[PDB]
Design a protein around this ligand. Sequence first.
Ligand SMILES: [Mg+2]
Ligand SMILES: [Mg+2]
Ligand SMILES: [Mg+2]
Ligand SMILES: [Mg+2]
Ligand SMILES: [Mg+2]
Ligand SMILES: [Mg+2]
Ligand SMILES: [Mg+2]
Ligand SMILES: [Mg+2]
Ligand SMILES: [Mg+2]
Ligand SMILES: [Mg+2]
Ligand SMILES: [Mg+2]
Ligand SMILES: [Mg+2]
Ligand SMILES: [Mg+2]
Ligand SMILES: [Mg+2]
Ligand SMILES: [Mg+2]
Ligand SMILES: [Mg+2]
Ligand SMILES: [Mg+2]
Ligand SMILES: [Mg+2]
Ligand SMILES: [Mg+2]
Ligand SMILES: [Mg+2]
Ligand SMILES: [Mg+2]
Ligand SMILES: [Mg+2]
Ligand SMILES: [Mg+2]
Ligand SMILES: [Mg+2]
Ligand SMILES: [Mg+2]
Ligand SMILES: [Mg+2]
Ligand SMILES: [Mg+2]
Ligand SMILES: [Mg+2]
Ligand SMILES: [Mg+2]
Ligand SMILES: [Mg+2]
Ligand SMILES: [Mg+2]
Ligand SMILES: [Mg+2]
Ligand SMILES: [Mg+2]
Ligand SMILES: [Mg+2]
Ligand SMILES: [Mg+2]
Ligand SMILES: [Mg+2]
Ligand SMILES: [Mg+2]
Ligand SMILES: [Mg+2]
Ligand SMILES: [Mg+2]
Ligand SMILES: [Mg+2]
Ligand SMILES: [Mg+2]
Ligand SMILES: [Mg+2]
Ligand SMILES: [Mg+2]
Ligand SMILES: [Mg+2]
Ligand SMILES: [Mg+2]
Ligand SMILES: [Mg+2]
Ligand SMILES: [Mg+2]
Ligand SMILES: [Mg+2]
Ligand SMILES: [Mg+2]
Ligand SMILES: [Mg+2]
Ligand SMILES: [Mg+2]
Ligand SMILES: [Mg+2]
Ligand SMILES: [Mg+2]
Ligand SMILES: [Mg+2]
Ligand SMILES: [Mg+2]
Ligand SMILES: [Mg+2]
Ligand SMILES: [Mg+2]
Ligand SMILES: [Mg+2]
Ligand SMILES: [Mg+2]
Ligand SMILES: [Mg+2]
Ligand SMILES: [Mg+2]
Ligand SMILES: [Mg+2]
Ligand SMILES: [Mg+2]
Ligand SMILES: [Mg+2]
Lengths: 70, 50, 155, 80, 141, 59
Amino acid sequence: VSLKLQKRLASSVLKCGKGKVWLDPNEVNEISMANSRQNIRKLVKDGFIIRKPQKIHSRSRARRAHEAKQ
Amino acid sequence: PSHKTFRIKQKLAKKQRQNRPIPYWIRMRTDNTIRYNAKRRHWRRTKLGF
Amino acid sequence: VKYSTDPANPTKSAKAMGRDLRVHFKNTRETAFALRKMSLNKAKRYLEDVLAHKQAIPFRRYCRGVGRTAQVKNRQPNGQGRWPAKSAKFVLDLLKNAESNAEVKGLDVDALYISHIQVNQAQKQRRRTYRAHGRINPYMSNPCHIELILSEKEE
Amino acid sequence: TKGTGSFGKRRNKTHTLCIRCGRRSFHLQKSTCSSCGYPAARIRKYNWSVKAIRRKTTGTGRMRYMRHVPRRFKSNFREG
Amino acid sequence: THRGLRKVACIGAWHPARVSYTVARAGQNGYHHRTEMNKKIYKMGKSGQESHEACTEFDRTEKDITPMGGFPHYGVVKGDYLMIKGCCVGPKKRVVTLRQSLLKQTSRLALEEIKLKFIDTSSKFGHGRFQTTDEKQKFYG
Amino acid sequence: VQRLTYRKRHSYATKSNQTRVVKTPGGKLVYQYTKKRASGPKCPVTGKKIQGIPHLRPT
RNA sequence: CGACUCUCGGCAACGGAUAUCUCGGCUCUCGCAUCGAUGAAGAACGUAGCGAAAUGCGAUACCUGGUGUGAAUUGCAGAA
RNA sequence: ACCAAGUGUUGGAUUGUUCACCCACCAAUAGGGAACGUGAGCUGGGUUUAGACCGUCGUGAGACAGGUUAGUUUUACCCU
RNA sequence: CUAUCCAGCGAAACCACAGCCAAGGGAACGGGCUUGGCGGAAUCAGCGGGGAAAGAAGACCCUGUUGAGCUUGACUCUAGU
RNA sequence: AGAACUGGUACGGACAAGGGGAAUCCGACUGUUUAAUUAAAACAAAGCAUUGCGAUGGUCCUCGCGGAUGCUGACGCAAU
RNA sequence: GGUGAACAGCCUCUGGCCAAUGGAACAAUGUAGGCAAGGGAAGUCGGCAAAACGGAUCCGUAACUUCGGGAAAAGGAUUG
RNA sequence: UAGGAGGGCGCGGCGGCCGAUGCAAAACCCGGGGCGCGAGCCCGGGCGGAGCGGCCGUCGGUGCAGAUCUUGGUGGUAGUAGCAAAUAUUCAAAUGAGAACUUUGAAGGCCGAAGAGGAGAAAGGUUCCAUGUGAACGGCACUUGCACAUGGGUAAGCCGAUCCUAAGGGAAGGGGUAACCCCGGCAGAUAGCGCGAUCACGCGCAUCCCCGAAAGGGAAUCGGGUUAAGAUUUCCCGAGCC
RNA sequence: UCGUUCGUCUGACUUGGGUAUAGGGGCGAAAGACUAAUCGAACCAUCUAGUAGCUGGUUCCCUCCGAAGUUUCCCUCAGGA
RNA sequence: UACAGGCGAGAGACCGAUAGCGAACAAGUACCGCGAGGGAAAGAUGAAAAGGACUUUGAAAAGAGAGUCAAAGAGUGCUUG
Ligand SMILES: [Mg+2]
Ligand SMILES: [Mg+2]
Ligand SMILES: [Mg+2]
Ligand SMILES: [Mg+2]
Ligand SMILES: [Mg+2]
Ligand SMILES: [Mg+2]
Ligand SMILES: [Mg+2]
Ligand SMILES: [Mg+2]
Ligand SMILES: [Mg+2]
Ligand SMILES: [Mg+2]
Ligand SMILES: [Mg+2]
Ligand SMILES: [Mg+2]
Ligand SMILES: [Mg+2]
Ligand SMILES: [Mg+2]
Ligand SMILES: [Mg+2]
Ligand SMILES: [Mg+2]
Ligand SMILES: [Mg+2]
Ligand SMILES: [Mg+2]
Ligand SMILES: [Mg+2]
Ligand SMILES: [Mg+2]
Ligand SMILES: [Mg+2]
Ligand SMILES: [Mg+2]
Ligand SMILES: [Mg+2]
Ligand SMILES: [Mg+2]
Ligand SMILES: [Mg+2]
Ligand SMILES: [Mg+2]
Ligand SMILES: [Mg+2]
Ligand SMILES: [Mg+2]
Ligand SMILES: [Mg+2]
Ligand SMILES: [Mg+2]
Ligand SMILES: [Mg+2]
Ligand SMILES: [Mg+2]
Ligand SMILES: [Mg+2]
Ligand SMILES: [Mg+2]
Ligand SMILES: [Mg+2]
Ligand SMILES: [Mg+2]
Ligand SMILES: [Mg+2]
Ligand SMILES: [Mg+2]
Ligand SMILES: [Mg+2]
Ligand SMILES: [Mg+2]
Ligand SMILES: [Mg+2]
Ligand SMILES: [Mg+2]
Ligand SMILES: [Mg+2]
Ligand SMILES: [Mg+2]
Ligand SMILES: [Mg+2]
Ligand SMILES: [Mg+2]
Ligand SMILES: [Mg+2]
Ligand SMILES: [Mg+2]
Ligand SMILES: [Mg+2]
Ligand SMILES: [Mg+2]
Ligand SMILES: [Mg+2]
Ligand SMILES: [Mg+2]
Ligand SMILES: [Mg+2]
Ligand SMILES: [Mg+2]
Ligand SMILES: [Mg+2]
Ligand SMILES: [Mg+2]
Ligand SMILES: [Mg+2]
Ligand SMILES: [Mg+2]
Ligand SMILES: [Mg+2]
Ligand SMILES: [Mg+2]
Ligand SMILES: [Mg+2]
Ligand SMILES: [Mg+2]
Ligand SMILES: [Mg+2]
Ligand SMILES: [Mg+2]
């Protein structure tokens, strides 16, 4: 079942990207059943739609490089 | 344009209505020859030229 | 509504039709020419086995360019055949519909067989393809009418 | 180049809708309609195209007032 | 050259207005039948006696004709065998027909007696460096 | 780093379209549209500035 | 025997010629003289319970009013 | 000179050149035909459009079997 | 990566009929004619000898009591001065 | 900037990133050009020279009235 | 963000995508990319195409000259 | 052969004559039977379902194999050429009649910020959003879609147009013109008169009109929320400004 | 049009919008280039069914008769008397 | 006396859907061009929709039976074909 309308309206609610929206695949039924920004937000507080954590870009190697340049 | 003059808005309003399938009850009407709307217009094919 | 050939016995034969089927006429013809005069059950086995890409439909009339296979040596020695899946899947539907017709009439669906199978051309459908130097050419399909009659075999 | 590369730059409108004739023939830079001759006092019409004349002669429109003139001639312009 | 390099440019003169049979064309190569004559016999290995092994009268490392790790694509030779100077038609494992000559062998090159000094045994699979796995084992420990 | 967009439809970067980046109580950067730089008034005789008059856009 | 090709007939297709039509055209003839600043011709936009075109009409909008005829409209519903 | 066409008849300098003429090898560096074999096989050096320059000619536009430079080389899937 | 095979989709140029050769004669270079050689179903993928292959009512040349651009000491005129 | 040590003398280790020289012809250079076969030695250029013109004037447009150079005037406009 | 002179190339973060019909096989001829022993332009009209040089620091830098250049001449060394 | 003439065959009308036809006309099909040297004709059978033929006179848009003829259809070529740039997809599960192409998750990758990101100008004009889908279309496929169908959506004193001028354009009087049309400084009681006063009048009138920029000049707005689709500053909340 | 390799890159530079010049006219750092895939004279309609000594085609049967490439003249030689 | 326009009439040895006006039909329409302008195709069920109820196979379009009709093999681009 299509959840394009819930990847959108979830990026718009969480204020993040479609690639960071995460819809818990075990209960796609209720996600589909909620067809509004209000009903997306109750799902956000209910824990079925979360922001995936931002992918890590560590500058530990940049710090150690500059520390080996001083 | 998002900045369209009112003339163009008024005259694009009409070409909205000008684009609909014929009412179904036209076809059953007696001594009729209308088989479909032979004046439909699609936005990617026929440009209104204005 | 009447078929090109009348059944050997009308009351004890089922019949099925389809018009303007969107499948290749040549491929379906080559299918039918392999399915003529087969038993119904063996025809279902064979044709589903064709769609399963395990036995091949010989190509004889419309054959020029068709590559060779070993899967069709038993019946066309030079082994020129293909596995037209869309054609086969469309013909299966009519074989099943005529099996159903024969069931409703009350015949021995175990003893039915392909008494008459005919594919024939239909009204082509038009599409356009765009070539070099601003030229267009037609890009048209060859839909076919498929017409078949199962009869009960007799001693 | 000429051709495909150069047909991409059709972006600005030389002609827009005339108000006298509703054709897309109003040359803006020149401020004259290229079919009805607007804003000339008289309508641009030429005898080198009777085909162009018949497309806009009398009788191709409503004739909101002249359609009733024959009926008013009959009975000779009577009002009670 | 437009349209490819590796080909024959002219496949014949205008007349005859045909492709001559002797023009070079593209087609099957190899797996042809060939007789290749006048191959000399150096040694017969008859299984079961001192003449079988790859020990000459000079070298005495007690080794068999098969190289280290067996003949590539063929395996280990246990049965009788011949050893012919020069190459042999076909790949490994191919059946070959040995036929007596049709000519009358009278030239010197036919009449030399062949006496070997050393039969290379280092594995033909890669750069073989030892003659016997036994010597390789003693070299590594 | 949260790229920006114009808040108007004046898509070209002319003189009248001076933009100032601000960070809002929402934690989000935006543009503000500023006034252009004004000369202020000058004395015709010497060409020097007139003191005591702020350099403002005339209106 | 069989496949392929050529071919004949029967039947089936594709295609819309012919045959019979025709609220249309063309041609000839006759009668009359009637656009517009009291805003014409043309154009645009609107307008129906269910309408997009064409036909009609103009915020009184597929019509208002008088007269004439005299029981309908009509594809559906409805008030009548 | 005879029987003799089985076999072979080369690498290079300069020229677009066939031809030519040198260097060297060679047993030998013979001649030829095949739509002056061979451009849906190549190349495009020459020639042979349009640009341009010099010279002679013509009053001029222009010409040159005079010289120089730049100048698109399309298609096979049919039959054999 | 294609080309090859497979599923699906699926055109066009072109086409008098068609397609094996030699010699002869012939509109002087034939797939058809004459005399010979031969000639055994049906397909697969290449190739570029041929079909004086396709593309184009030859631009080279000539004919035309056809033009056109340009020139001038051509013929007849003309704005302007 | 300098040094000691170290490595299978490898070190702008990938990426990025001039081949050099001796000359001749042509055009001084920079620039522009036949969109879809010619980017050049062609065109332009500054430099040089020449010619007309002092306003009732020179070159030029315009069917006519009138107009461009000229918001100008010889260290300028105009034509080569 | 890193390297780097650098809005070069190469790689990653936010944001966006895996959309260009897929399955099997690895034959010839292709299109694009490479590598080659000895020689090093003999090829060809022609060094066409490719290879080679390429950053930086230090040194050195010819003829000719309009004395401004030539010049990043050429020729060497170093680089982790 | 080029050519000429005679006699006939055939198509469609008109004036006449003789007829046929729902017990089957016209047309068309046939391995049916014949007549004529031949153009052509007569009969038989089938489909067909309403008209038609013969003879005399006479009339004509009257006979096709070509014209690289015109319109329409159909072939062989041919299931052939082909579908190949932009690195790349893989696995479970869900939906579904049907999944390499839909959706969720997971993994591998690419764009690499002068982007394959976020927004605009011109241009398009409803493509935006939701729900549904028989066909057609998306050069394979599809439950899917920028497709088809029914609905919905664009909120401004502050963002722009509107206002002012630029290059320039149109013009009132006049000059030209056969007339459309062409000239704007040519100076004309000039288009406009203005301002203080109306409890009215006085003074001034100078290079004298309109149009022309969503990139020039420019009265004023910021923050936070909110929708399936509007808004950053258009709606709501607060606080301001002209 | 695509790929690599190239030219220039503070300038006689690259470019959007507004605006001016329209066909024997415009505009041209000059190639007869450009003026809407058209330029050694755009495109649209009309005069127009332009003219042609030239190419191509020119529609049913039978019967009968049945030739010429020669004279003369012509801006006449592919033609006509 | 004139009269391819308009309004209203009448007739025809005319055309019979590739014919006749370009247009028998939502024809100067759809569509093309920036613009001047260019510009088609498209008629026939049956007497009457009586336009195919229903059963069954199919996911569905449809098929097979059935039914309406004088005939549906006249079954919504449907007279013959
Ligand atoms: Mg194109
Ligand atoms: Mg431009
Ligand atoms: Mg313009
Ligand atoms: Mg080449
Ligand atoms: Mg080995
Ligand atoms: Mg700036
Ligand atoms: Mg050839
Ligand atoms: Mg050349
Ligand atoms: Mg030349
Ligand atoms: Mg001279
Ligand atoms: Mg010459
Ligand atoms: Mg010459
Ligand atoms: Mg296939
Ligand atoms: Mg021959
Ligand atoms: Mg021939
Ligand atoms: Mg013979
Ligand atoms: Mg192939
Ligand atoms: Mg073949
Ligand atoms: Mg080939
Ligand atoms: Mg050939
Ligand atoms: Mg010719
Ligand atoms: Mg003559
Ligand atoms: Mg002339
Ligand atoms: Mg003279
Ligand atoms: Mg130069
Ligand atoms: Mg060029
Ligand atoms: Mg070039
Ligand atoms: Mg003057
Ligand atoms: Mg650094
Ligand atoms: Mg970078
Ligand atoms: Mg090498
Ligand atoms: Mg060389
Ligand atoms: Mg050489
Ligand atoms: Mg050589
Ligand atoms: Mg040479
Ligand atoms: Mg090179
Ligand atoms: Mg030097
Ligand atoms: Mg005729
Ligand atoms: Mg005919
Ligand atoms: Mg014909
Ligand atoms: Mg003929
Ligand atoms: Mg293929
Ligand atoms: Mg390709
Ligand atoms: Mg930037
Ligand atoms: Mg973007
Ligand atoms: Mg959408
Ligand atoms: Mg598709
Ligand atoms: Mg204004
Ligand atoms: Mg503005
Ligand atoms: Mg502004
Ligand atoms: Mg508020
Ligand atoms: Mg390129
Ligand atoms: Mg510009
Ligand atoms: Mg410009
Ligand atoms: Mg052009
Ligand atoms: Mg004529
Ligand atoms: Mg003509
Ligand atoms: Mg002749
Ligand atoms: Mg004569
Ligand atoms: Mg007639
Ligand atoms: Mg017609
Ligand atoms: Mg009927
Ligand atoms: Mg009837
Ligand atoms: Mg029919």
